[PDB]
A paper describes a structure:
We studied one type III effector from plant pathogenic bacteria called Pseudomonas syringae. This effector, termed avirulence protein B (AvrB), is targeted to the inner face of the plant cell plasma membrane, where it interacts with a membrane-bound host protein called RIN4 (resistance to Pseudomonas maculicula protein–interacting protein). A crystal structure of free AvrB revealed that it adopts a novel bilobal fold with no structural homologies to previously characterized proteins or functional domains. The junction of the two lobes forms a large solvent-accessible cleft with a volume of over 900 Å3 that extends into the lower lobe to form a pocket rich in conserved residues. Our data significantly extend previous observations defining the key functional regions of the type III effector protein AvrB: its upper lobe and interlobal cleft mediate contact with the Arabidopsis target protein RIN4, and the lower lobe contains a pocket suitable for binding ADP or another similarly shaped molecule.
We therefore examined binding to nucleotides, including adenosine triphosphate (ATP), adenosine diphosphate (ADP), guanosine diphosphate, and nonhydrolyzable ATP and guanosine diphosphate analogs, by soaking these into AvrB crystals. We found that crystallized AvrB could bind ADP within the lower lobe pocket of the large cavity (referred to as the ADP pocket). Significant interactions with ADP involve AvrB residues Y65, R99, and R266. Y65 stacks below the adenine ring and hydrogen bonds to the 2-OH group of the ribose, while R99 and R266 form salt bridges with the alpha- and beta-phosphates, respectively. N62 and F113 also contact the adenine base and phosphates, respectively. The conserved AvrB residues Y131 and D297 located at the interlobe boundary are approximately 4 Å from ADP and appear to contact it only via bridging water molecules. Mutation of ADP-binding residues in AvrBY65A, AvrBR99A, and AvrBR266A resulted in complete loss of AvrB-induced RPM1 function. The requirement of ADP interacting residues for AvrB phosphorylation suggests that nucleotide binding by AvrB is critical for this event. By contrast, the important ADP-contacting residues Y65, R99, and R266 in the lower lobe pocket are conserved in all AvrB homologs, suggesting that nucleotide binding is a core function for this entire type III effector family. In the AvrB/ADP structure, we could not definitively observe a Mg2+ ion.
Author numbering: 16 to 53, 57 to 319
Write the structure that this text describes.
Amino acid sequence: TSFNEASRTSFRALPGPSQRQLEVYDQCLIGAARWPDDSNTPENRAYCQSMYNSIRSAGDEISRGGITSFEELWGRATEWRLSKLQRGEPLYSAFASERTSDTDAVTPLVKPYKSVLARVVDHEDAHDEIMQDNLFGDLNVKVYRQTAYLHGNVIPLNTFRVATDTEYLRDRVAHLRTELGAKALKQHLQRYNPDRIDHTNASYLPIIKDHLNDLYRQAISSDLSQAELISLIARTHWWAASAMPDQRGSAAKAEFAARAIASAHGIELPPFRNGNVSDIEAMLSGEEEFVEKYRSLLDSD
Ligand SMILES: Nc1ncnc2c1ncn2[C@@H]1O[C@H](COP(=O)(O)OP(=O)(O)O)[C@@H](O)[C@H]1O
């Protein structure tokens, strides 16, 4: 329909960021973690406020054909994210880089993720299973295996492991903490902590990134009802958060992208309800159920 000279791409004009804006109080909640087990310093509030401003700005770009692919949106999300990193940060590179096969893909379910232990144990789709470890030996774990449907191929995304033999673990740790030392232990425990999330294999990123581009293409249509629109946004958020494309910062980028797309359509999405951590809520569910409850995870609506 229209043509953007700057990027040399035709597009369909959309209603940029609405003029009605979230209350400055909610603006400072956008992109915040908000763990149910409890962190709102002037910094945390400024970080969120900034995410809010940049979200609407990228949404403005999208509505003008300035951003033309998901990959491009993810890039704007990454650059905003990197701007919040302290000068000379050694982690800077992890926040700017995509994840690969021989790299970190595990999140030990310790503080601040403690509240995930319950969600897994009580998960209607979790199944008892026996985990084999070179250290702890065999353990009884409640396991939730997140999967996705893609072109007829059902793939495994995130896997949650939660050891159930409490007493036995206390003793195993005590013994090991003396046979390997607090040091060697933490290293092995960085990848094999009884309670952990084994993230999506990086080998699936390419088809997932392509799928995210396909949802973006759909999401920027000018003839979508707000019901069809909200669904697409929830899906995009689901796939992005569950894929965890980058070595670091995926949840911020994922939420940023999802809200940038909504913002391009005028939708001013309020922050997530206290206790509702978007990426985790996504990793703990199937695509369809996540889309169904997306609205309820947000404040008003
Ligand atoms: N300074 C901060 N204040 C408030 N929330 C933050 C801050 N930094 C990051 N977050 C948020 O907390 C979550 C963790 O981000 P994520 O990128 O997945 O983490 P990491 O790669 O560091 O594990 C996201 O919801 C993110 O937007």
